[PDB]
Amino acid sequence: RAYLWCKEFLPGAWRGLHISVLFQCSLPDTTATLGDEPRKVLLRLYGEAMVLESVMFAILAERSLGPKLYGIFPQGRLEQFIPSRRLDTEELSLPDISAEIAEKMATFHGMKMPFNKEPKWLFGTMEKYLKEVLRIKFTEESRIKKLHKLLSYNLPLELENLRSLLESTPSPVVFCHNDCQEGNILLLEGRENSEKQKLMLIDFEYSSYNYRGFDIGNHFCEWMYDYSYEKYPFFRANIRKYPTKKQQLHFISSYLPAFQNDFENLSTEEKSIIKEEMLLEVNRFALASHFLWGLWSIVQAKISSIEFGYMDYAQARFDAYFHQKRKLGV
Amino acid sequence: EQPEPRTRRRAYLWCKEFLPGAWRGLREDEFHISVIRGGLSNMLFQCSLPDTTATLGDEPRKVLLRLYAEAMVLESVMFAILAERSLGPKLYGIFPQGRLEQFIPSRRLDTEELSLPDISAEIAEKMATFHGMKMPFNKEPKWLFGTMEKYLKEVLRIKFTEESRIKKLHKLLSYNLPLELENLRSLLESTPSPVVFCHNDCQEGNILLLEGRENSEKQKLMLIDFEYSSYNYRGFDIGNHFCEWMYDYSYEKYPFFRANIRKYPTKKQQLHFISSYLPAFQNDFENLSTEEKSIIKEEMLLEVNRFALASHFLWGLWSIVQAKISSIEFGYMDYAQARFDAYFHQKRKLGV
Ligand SMILES: OC(c1ccc(Cl)s1)(c1ccc(Cl)s1)[C@H]1CN2CCC1CC2
Ligand SMILES: OC(c1ccc(Cl)s1)(c1ccc(Cl)s1)[C@H]1CN2CCC1CC2
């Protein structure tokens, strides 16, 4: 099946003619490349709505901000295989890494995409997941209990509180990644010694026009979560790992001149004003990351096959939401 | 011509939501929209900012709205890629009901303009550029015979009710189309042709003569409407274009087309076309020997002239199917006969 996708969609030596588990499709080591065709490709089997993700991946491939698109078919797609590794959670805090993510995020934000520019994504998704959460019934007594504790916060009332806080919080609408976590950041092989070009932002499943503060606040929230933990619930949460004001300022001091052209040419006092207001903007939007992903995770506990403690994760996001509300005095 | 109130409201919402700058804060009463192309399939509209409104950034003053089975996914990706490589109109917005694309001030070429040496040479260069494209689609040349077999299977099942359509179908069927498809298959089997990304409908109605550029000898045209595009034999794309010289679709009375076999390009006109196509396609071409260049050229004429037979066959079958399924007024059965008449005339000329 994959043999016929790689044979029919790929040029040169493939048109004549190895697979590993996502799939790593390759040509034999003794086979000589006829031209610029790839020796090793990546196959993505799935399992509007595909029209938008496809056009987006095609555009990012064309603009070199994503992996190349080699083939597109109903069952999935053939993409460029990038020799790399994903970053770990502890590396998000590294100054060079943090500064590069901010630059790669700033670049992604300035991109013009053929999608709805109305920032509906944030609240529309939260309402969609909230409507589902209130009608979910679990069979297991342990899950019924965990849900009962989450529903006890009165989620529709909390959403209206978050709505009022965010409406009185100006944040520009940009093309957001919406999932800027370590698992979506590639550390490029060989390029490890590069100070400012060793990374790549990937996996645009959630990308849309959204409030800038959500992409930044959401990334700040991601410093607290490590999804590599090998024992149940298959994640580790650490509130103390949220960026300090200094680490948050280092991130924005790299984000701002990379996004706003004039920024560098402003006065020291003016630069601090934009920055101080930006810390308020992103820390408020961090609350929407906890809320969005917390609701998402309850819906995921009901529908997903994947081995992950979804209900514990929802509780860890809701704990962080209330902790962050307290920190902000909101 | 103004659209229907429901269309005008939906169009206004798509423009204010997908288009940036002055569009984001436009009132319904400030929205300008007019029909470009009517019908039921692919309605076209020009949408615009009032002339009194200033632009804020680099947003367009006017756009084209195109108002329309996952062939929609591939078609959308194709338009996006071509828009990115500056080979098609810019894509401003994609939604289930349609697209917002760049408005290009121009007119389409007329059939008579295809023969013009400068026009012909430029079409050859843009077609050659189009063929050098790497697209993420199936590279097996299954389009041609797959489409023809698909149309033929449909044609063998067709039962018309109108007496003249019945009589016309009887004549076409009498040629023994399945047997004729096999004769065509074996002829093309012994005709080598490189598999490239083809337009597959490179006719006058899909070529834009760009406004202001009518003095630019080599850069005044643009190929558009890539709905039939796929990986196909290079022979087809060129052969199909040569067949298009014979058909004028602007005829205002039924059958809504004029066919003239004498308008097919002469060896001279074909050689002029392939003489612009070849250095545009390989770039090292001019530096080859006179005997090698003449051999490449003579093999190329034979290849495109044989594939022209598949152009006649494919559109003749498509036309019969359209007579059954389409709602658009066109003399489809007369058009099918016109393509089959040409097909047998081209067979006799090739001595095959
Ligand atoms: O998709 C996740 C999943 C976590 C657990 C799952 Cl089961 S899917 C990640 C994808 C890849 C990772 Cl590595 S973590 C997380 C990343 N963000 C979106 C959804 C999750 C919370 C925030
Ligand atoms: O699309 C057509 C149509 C003709 C009649 C129709 Cl009804 S659609 C053209 C569109 C615009 C033209 Cl100008 S010709 C023709 C161009 N090629 C594809 C189908 C037709 C034959 C070859």
UniProtKB/Swiss-Prot annotation, chain A:
Which molecular function GO terms apply here? ATP binding; choline kinase activity; cholinesterase activity; ethanolamine kinase activity; protein homodimerization activity; protein tyrosine kinase activity
Keywords from UniProt, A to Z, are: Acetylation, ATP-binding, Cytoplasm, Disease variant, Epilepsy, Intellectual disability, Kinase, Lipid biosynthesis, Lipid droplet, Lipid metabolism, Nucleotide-binding, Phospholipid biosynthesis, Phospholipid metabolism, Phosphoprotein, Transferase, Tyrosine-protein kinase
Spell out the subcellular localization from the entry.
Cytoplasm, Cytosol
Q: Where does the protein principally reside?
A: cytoplasm
Q: What class of enzyme is it?
A: transferase
The Phosphoserine modification is found at 152
Q: How is the activity of this protein regulated?
A: Homodimerization or heterodimerization is required for the choline and ethanolamine kinase activities.
GO BP terms: CDP-choline pathway; cellular response to glucose starvation; lipid droplet disassembly; lipid metabolic process; lipid transport; phosphatidylcholine biosynthetic process; phosphatidylethanolamine biosynthetic process
Query: What disease does the Swiss-Prot or TrEMBL record associate with this chain?
Result: Neurodevelopmental disorder with microcephaly, movement abnormalities, and seizures: An autosomal recessive neurodevelopmental disorder characterized by severe global developmental delay, impaired intellectual development, microcephaly, early-onset seizures, and movement abnormalities.
Explain what the record says happens when changing residue 67 to S.
Answer: In NEDMIMS; a functional model in yeast shows reduced choline kinase activity
Residues with N6-acetyllysine modification? 120
Subunit architecture: Homodimer. Heterodimer with CHKB.
Q: What is this protein called?
A: Choline kinase alpha
Does this UniProt record's set of keywords contain Acetylation?
A: yes
Which residues are ATP-binding?
Answer: 44, 80-86, 181, 203
Q: Quick one: which pathway?
A: Phospholipid metabolism; phosphatidylcholine biosynthesis; phosphocholine from choline: step 1/1; Phospholipid metabolism; phosphatidylethanolamine biosynthesis; phosphatidylethanolamine from ethanolamine: step 1/3
Q: In the Enzyme Commission scheme, what number(s) does this protein have?
A: 2.7.1.32, 2.7.1.82
Q: Any idea what job this protein has? A: Plays a key role in phospholipid biosynthesis by catalyzing the phosphorylation of free choline to phosphocholine, the first step in phosphatidylcholine biosynthesis. Also phosphorylates ethanolamine, thereby contributing to phosphatidylethanolamine biosynthesis. Has higher activity with choline. May contribute to tumor cell growth.
Catalytic activity field:
choline + ATP = phosphocholine + ADP + H(+); ethanolamine + ATP = phosphoethanolamine + ADP + H(+)
Q: Which GO terms describe its cellular component?
A: cytoplasm; cytosol; lipid droplet
Tell me the protein family, please: Belongs to the choline/ethanolamine kinase family.
Q: Which organism is it from?
A: Homo sapiens (Human)
Q: What is the effect of changing residue 152 to A?
A: Abolished phosphorylation by AMPK, preventing localization to lipid droplets and subsequent acetylation by KAT5
